[PDB]
Design a protein around this ligand. Structure first.
Ligand SMILES: *[C@@H]1O[C@H](CO)[C@@H](O[C@@H]2O[C@H](CO)[C@@H](O)[C@H](O)[C@H]2NC(C)=O)[C@H](O)[C@H]1NC(C)=O
Ligand SMILES: CC(C)CCC[C@@H](C)[C@H]1CC[C@H]2[C@@H]3CC=C4C[C@@H](O)CC[C@]4(C)[C@H]3CC[C@]12C
Ligand SMILES: *[C@@H]1O[C@H](CO)[C@@H](O)[C@H](O)[C@H]1NC(C)=O
Ligand SMILES: [Mg+2]
Ligand SMILES: [Rb+]
Ligand SMILES: [Rb+]
Ligand SMILES: [Rb+]
Lengths: 992, 39, 268
């Protein structure tokens, strides 16, 4: 469906003005007829974007109500009402058991539904942001007259007019223009104004001057044009549809959840029906056969687990909110940890998005300035008298000014009225020479010639601030070579000197080096005009050369670039040390893209492209073995004629990849290419041209300050302070939460065994029921909750940023090793500790373990109010039941006591508690509150009715203590083996 | 005692409940203290 | 195979065999020590049987015994359980001076055979003749229910003293030696008739205290036969038999805590 939109567009900028009118039945001068425009409206439809059909929240909520655990809990809830129905008909049961348990279980499903619904959130308003880029109104020429109309009423063929400050209402063929410049950052991510004129200037319509696009704005001048595309058919309207239309897809974390749901659901249905038939064979009435099944359901399903996961995710997202990293989708909290490839935009993401002075060439020396936002570098020069001469030209031969009321904000961050290069120079001098306004007050400008297309230079004449002179100084800047052809002397370390071929060659060298760094280079020179030839009232003519512009003194060079953000180089290296592949994907030109790649460490030192090898060896590129080149730089124009299989080979064959001059669909294609190889991919960006890629990414991260509204709609995560170091933190947090989820899951599952085994022995042994159904829910929904959550606050056991990204195909959240430990080893020890306390309670009340076998028949018989114990005493029905429920209560408390040790062992997968310590305060809180809850549930009056919880005698609490301790020792010995031999036996069997 | 051994079939479940609830409360307070060591 | 290789499948079996073996051996060990802390003659706790339950022979479907006099197999179900109990109180079962003793044919005081020790043989229990149960196949019309006080080791059932008012106000009040049992329904549409030891409507105190199964096997607890020769027919009659005493109490939950709940209906 969207495969059409993933392709490069076709256009009609090649046609003549006249020819273009024939195609759209239009007038170049009079414009369309009121009738013809209305006709075309009904024909083509409105100049608007329609949002894609969404899934209502209704269906979204209910889709969770049927996912493995909820299905089993539904079967339980209904099976409760089943047994209740069968009762209400047969023998009038005045009880509330099956009825209430059926109500409780149905509530558990609904509430669990809210948790998973909260986790599976999708806040997407892509198409809405795009719609915000179409103006409310447009100016059209109809019947030879200009009028404002609803922009939706704009059709292909009419004559539209735009001017500085307004949004392009539709894709236009420029037919007339006067000084028109446009901001195409929507399509390129670059905000430098692009001229628009009627002349065709490139075969590529996205590069030609005679096309203006919807989603962009006119920055200055005026233009008229013929509408060629409207609504969804515009270049960026298609990007809108592509972006808004892209299928979301399941996250890595989501896939893991479903996976263990299958496992646990599997064992649940297995043991469920495996013992349902095992009971009927033993001659159990279907009346009972279902009651046992309900218990089996409740025992096997970890009722509180899915909600635990959600809370652990939420708590991890809260910590990241506190580092200026907003998470829109709870699952995106983990994806960053599983990320193996980052596709990053350059401008406004890796870079500050601001022309900044990078180097200066004066005194036959290359000086480097500090490009960082917060200025974390050092000085270059202050002493040289040459510097002050260059500094003066940079301030004086400059027409840029700071906007009013910025004195509060830092120099480099403040808004400037002017072109990017003049702003850069302004901020450079203001920083290291103080107030520039001061320099422009001490040296009043009397005449100037602003930068001309033809002159290729800008000159200014000022009253020298010096009192002993107060004469006229000439300054000029422009193209380095043009400035050179106008110089005779060079200000070396203070004093001038003739411009010999020697210094002239050093100039060329300096010029070539700076240009090689992808930096824009300017020349600077001045000339102190002779006093006798220029009186204090001498008039200077700016129109006609009234003053010399030759034999001037060359002062120096200055170079500039849109520099990396301070934290970016280090963040890139850190991603790469964690084994994450970092690719650059930018709408910017290749020379600039490549230079920043080396600056931030995308391309490491020494690595070459095929073009680099060819130039170094002075040989044809076809003569170069492409396998000798680990780095590559792909232009979008070449990308366009490559198949995906060939794109896949590029991705496979290079470690250091730069995709430059890419369109928005091309970014999507590169992302998909990476994913196709089985990689989890993150995208980082800030422009509307990142929207499709951000949507398709497993996780999209947008910049918060510099980011466009669209990009932040398309993302899963926002960096609110533009701190790229947050990606590094995000991946670290993502890995940590992945491990801690394992700990929390094992902990929760472990207690399933002591809830399953009592029901089994109840059938096979014919003893009184050791633990009840209600009692199970008091564990999974009550006591285990805070402890399970607390594992989310566990510190790393080792340097997680030192390991490679997990293999999502092999490294699962829940594997066989977890089940073996939780179900086969620790849970089994917990089961016994439960049974022990059960036998203790009964034996101390007169029913010794031996006489318990095959007694349930008489025990449950409501009409036998005289059962004989081991000592020959006789018990009524309600009397023995009180002891039985007291057994449920102590078995319950036994679970809590054995979960103490389990909580401590689940703390660490490898390390010892004596190494990791007990610095998790939430965990300790869990221990205290868990025990408080259990005690309250046993001793609070009335709980014997609502939950069948009975007061325990002090000695009862200590039954499971020896089992709780064996767990601690056992797991500590086991992990001691793991560490002592990384070989594999204990490791490959039990290492979560 | 002999025929007056009524105490043999008696248990102070009332005190046990009072003590049990005291303990539960104090464990609840202790937990808050440790948690609130930083929020 | 599914998971691993044969070598791995073996090792995982050798482990869980030794592992579960140890766990079973430990579990058993903790059961040993538990038993080691317990007496053979007396349970550690008795507060959960404390107030004695009162149970009867007619096995009630739901605290009810409804049947038809004009039908044979209508009551043959209740006669099965009635027989089961009384069959134990046979004279052939109580033979010789061992381990039985002839006790007062009239309600007497308690009998202490020492302590709950094995320092003596089987503590000798009082004989009880089912022949003390006058009038009661059993009552084919108007049932002859048999009551019973639940056995509790070292329990001395103490009758109420005639200090103040009483339900069966002072009638045949053998204050010193009888634990009374008065059945009731207002709703007085019946005819209560009690049979027992010495002809009294109670339990003779000479059968106490019970020394337990280990120290007193073949021991016999006193019975109290109750006959309802009601002149009514074809209606559910809620009859409650209540025992009175210092050590006797009741509960709204446990409807068998020192009392009966019988729903007789001679639907004939
Ligand atoms: C306990 O006493 C009952 C009294 O009914 C015995 O029942 C006797 O059963 C036999 C054989 O079935 C009959 O011939 C008699 O008529 C019954 N009564 C009597 C008085 O002998 C019963 O057998 C006795 N049980 C034991 C174990 O001795
Ligand atoms: C109540 C009692 C009788 C039930 C005992 C169940 C035992 C036999 C179960 C419980 C957990 C189970 C193990 C759980 C995990 C694994 C790892 C997997 O890669 C192979 C099977 C294996 C090794 C299972 C084998 C059987 C097992 C040990
Ligand atoms: C009980 O049986 C005796 C004979 O043993 C008889 O005289 C008497 O009438 C019976 N009593 C009743 C109330 O039927
Ligand atoms: Mg950008
Ligand atoms: Rb469970
Ligand atoms: Rb995404
Ligand atoms: Rb559990």
């Amino acid at each position: 469906l969207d495969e059409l939109k993933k392709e490069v567009s076709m256009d009609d900028h090649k046609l003549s003005l006249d020819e273009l009118h024939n195609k759209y039945g239009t007038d170049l001068t009079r414009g369309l007829t009121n009738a013809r425009a209305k006709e075309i409206l009904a024909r083509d439809g409105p100049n608007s974007l329609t949002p894609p059909p969404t899934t209502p929240e209704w269906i979204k909520f209910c889709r969770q109500l049927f996912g493995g655990f909820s299905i089993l809990l539904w079967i339980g809830a209904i099976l409760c009402f089943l047994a209740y129905g069968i009762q209400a008909a047969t023998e009038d049961e005045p009880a509330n058991d099956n009825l209430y348990l059926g109500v409780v279980l149905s509530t558990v499903v609904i509430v669990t539904g809210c948790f998973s619904y909260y986790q599976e959130a999708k806040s997407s308003r892509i198409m809405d942001s795009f719609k915000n880029m179409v103006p409310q109104q447009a100016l059209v020429i109809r019947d030879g007259e200009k009028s404002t109309i609803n922009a939706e009423f704009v059709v292909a063929g009419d004559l539209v007019e735009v001017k500085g400050g307004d949004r392009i209402p539709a894709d236009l063929r420029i037919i007339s223009a006067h000084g028109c410049k446009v901001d195409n950052s929507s399509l390129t991510g670059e905000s430098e104004p692009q001229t628009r004129s009627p002349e065709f200037s490139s075969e590529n319509p996205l590069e030609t001057r005679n096309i203006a696009f919807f989603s962009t704005n006119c920055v200055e001048g005026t233009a008229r044009g013929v509408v060629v595309y409207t609504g969804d058919r515009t270049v960026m309207g298609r990007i809108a549809t592509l972006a808004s239309g892209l299928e979301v897809g399941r996250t890595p974390i989501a896939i893991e959840i479903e996976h263990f749901i299958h496992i646990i659901t599997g064992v649940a249905v297995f043991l469920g029906v495996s013992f349902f038939i095992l009971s009927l064979i033993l001659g159990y009435s279907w009346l009972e056969a279902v009651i046992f099944l309900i218990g089996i359901i409740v025992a096997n399903v970890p009722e509180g687990l899915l909600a635990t996961v959600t809370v652990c995710l939420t708590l991890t997202a809260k910590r990241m909110a506190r580092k200026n990293c907003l998470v829109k989708n709870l699952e995106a909290v983990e994806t960053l940890g599983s990320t193996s490839t980052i596709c990053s935009d350059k401008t406004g993401t890796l870079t500050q998005n601001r022309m900044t002075v990078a180097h200066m060439w004066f005194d036959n020396q290359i000086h480097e300035a500090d490009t960082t936002e917060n200025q974390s570098g050092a000085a270059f020069d202050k002493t040289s008298a040459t510097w002050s001469a260059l500094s003066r030209i940079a301030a004086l031969c400059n027409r840029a000014v700071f906007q009013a009321g910025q004195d509060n904000v830092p120099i480099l961050k403040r808004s400037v009225a002017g072109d990017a290069s003049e702003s850069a120079l302004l901020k450079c001098i203001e920083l290291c020479c103080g107030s520039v306004q001061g320099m422009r007050d001490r040296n009043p400008k009397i005449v100037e010639i602003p930068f001309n297309s033809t002159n290729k230079y800008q000159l200014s004449i000022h009253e020298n601030e010096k009192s002993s002179e107060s004469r006229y100084l000439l300054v000029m800047k422009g193209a380095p070579e043009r400035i050179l052809d106008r110089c005779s002397t060079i200000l070396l370390n203070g004093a001038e000197e003739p411009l010999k071929e020697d210094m002239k060659e050093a100039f060329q060298n300096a010029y070539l080096e700076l240009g090689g760094l992808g930096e824009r280079v300017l020349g600077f020179c001045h000339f102190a005009l002779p006093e006798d030839k220029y009186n204090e009232g001498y008039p200077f003519d700016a129109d006609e050369p009234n003053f010399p512009t030759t034999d001037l003194c060359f002062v120096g060079l200055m170079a500039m670039i849109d520099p990396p953000r301070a934290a970016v180089p280090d963040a890139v290296g850190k991603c790469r040390s964690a084994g994450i592949k970092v690719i650059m994907v930018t709408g910017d030109h290749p020379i600039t893209a490549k230079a920043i790649a080396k600056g931030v460490g995308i391309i490491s030192e020494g690595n070459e492209t095929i073009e680099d090898i060819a130039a170094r060896l002075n040989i044809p590129i076809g003569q170069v073995n492409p396998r000798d080149a680990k780095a590559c730089v792909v232009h979008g124009s070449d990308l366009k004629d490559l198949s995906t299989e060939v794109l896949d080979d590029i991705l496979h064959y290079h470690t250091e990849i730069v995709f430059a001059r890419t369109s928005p669909q091309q970014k999507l294609i590169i992302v998909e290419g990476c994913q196709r190889q089985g990689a989890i991919v993150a995208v980082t960006g800030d422009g509307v041209n990142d929207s499709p890629a951000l949507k398709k990414a497993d996780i999209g991260v947008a910049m918060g300050i510099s980011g466009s509204d669209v990009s932040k709609q398309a993302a899963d995560m926002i960096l609110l302070d533009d701190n790229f170091a947050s990606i590094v933190t995000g991946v670290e947090e993502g890995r940590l939460i992945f491990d801690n989820l394992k700990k929390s899951i094992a902990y929760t599952l472990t207690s399933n065994i002591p809830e399953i085994t009592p029901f089994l022995v109840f059938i096979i042994g014919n003893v009184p029921l050791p633990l009840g159904t209600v009692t199970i829910l008091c564990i999974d929904l009550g006591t285990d909750m805070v402890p399970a959550i607390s594992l989310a606050y566990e510190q790393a056991e080792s340097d997680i940023m030192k390991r490679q990204p997990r293999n999502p195909k092999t490294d699962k959240l829940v594997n066989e090793r977890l089940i073996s430990m939780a179900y086969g080893q620790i849970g089994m020890i917990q089961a016994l500790g439960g049974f022990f306390s059960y036998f203790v309670i009964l034996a101390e009340n007169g029913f010794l373990p031996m006489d318990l076998i095959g007694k349930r028949v008489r025990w449950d018989d409501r009409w036998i109010s005289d059962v004989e114990d081991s000592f020959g005493q006789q018990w009524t029905y309600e009397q023995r039941k009180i002891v039985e429920f007291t057994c449920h209560t102590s078995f319950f408390i036994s679970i809590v006591v054995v979960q103490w040790a389990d909580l401590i062992i689940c703390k660490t997968r490898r390390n010892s508690i004596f190494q990791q310590g007990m610095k998790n305060k939430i965990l300790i809180f869990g221990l205290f509150e868990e025990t408080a809850l259990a005690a309250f549930l046993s001793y609070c009056p009335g709980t014997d009715v609502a939950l069948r919880m009975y007061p325990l005698k002090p000695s009862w609490w200590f039954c499971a203590f020896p089992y709780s301790l064996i767990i601690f020792l056992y797991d500590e010995m086991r992990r001691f083996i793991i560490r002592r031999s990384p070989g594999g036996w204990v490791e490959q069997e039990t290492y979560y | 005692e002999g025929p007056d051994n009524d105490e043999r079939f008696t248990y102070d479940y009332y005190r046990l409940r009072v003590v049990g609830l005291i303990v539960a409360a104090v464990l609840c307070v202790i937990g808050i203290i440790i948690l609130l060591a930083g929020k | 195979f599914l998971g691993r290789t044969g070598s791995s499948w073996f090792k995982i079996f050798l482990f869980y065999l030794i592992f579960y073996g140890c766990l079973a051996g430990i579990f058993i060990g903790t059961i040993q020590v538990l038993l080691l802390t317990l007496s053979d003659f007396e349970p550690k706790y008795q507060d959960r049987v404390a107030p004695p339950g009162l149970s009867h022979a007619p096995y009630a479907i739901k605290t009810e015994i409804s049947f038809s006099i004009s039908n044979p197999k209508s009551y043959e179900s209740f006669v099965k359980s009635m027989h089961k109990l009384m069959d134990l109180y046979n004279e052939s079962s109580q033979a010789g001076n061992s381990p039985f003793e002839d006790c007062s044919d009239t309600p007497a005081d308690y009998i202490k055979r020492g302590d709950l020790d094995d320092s003596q043989g089987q503590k000798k229990a009082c004989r009880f003749s089912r022949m003390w149960l006058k009038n009661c196949g059993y009552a084919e019309g108007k049932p002859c229910v048999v009551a019973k006080l639940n056995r509790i080791i070292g329990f001395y059932p103490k009758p109420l003293k005639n200090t103040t008012d009483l339900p069966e106000e002072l009638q045949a009040n053998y204050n010193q030696y009888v634990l009374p049992l008065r059945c009731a329904a207002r709703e007085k549409i019946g005819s209560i008739e009690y049979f027992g030891l010495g002809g009294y409507a109670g339990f003779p105190l000479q059968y106490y205290p019970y020394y337990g199964k280990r120290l007193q096997k073949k021991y016999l607890q006193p019975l109290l036969a109750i006959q309802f020769t009601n002149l009514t027919q074809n209606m559910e009659l809620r009859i409650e038999c209540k025992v009175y005493g210092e050590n006797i109490d009741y509960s709204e939950k446990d409807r068998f805590r020192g009392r009966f709940e019988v729903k007789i209906e001679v639907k004939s």
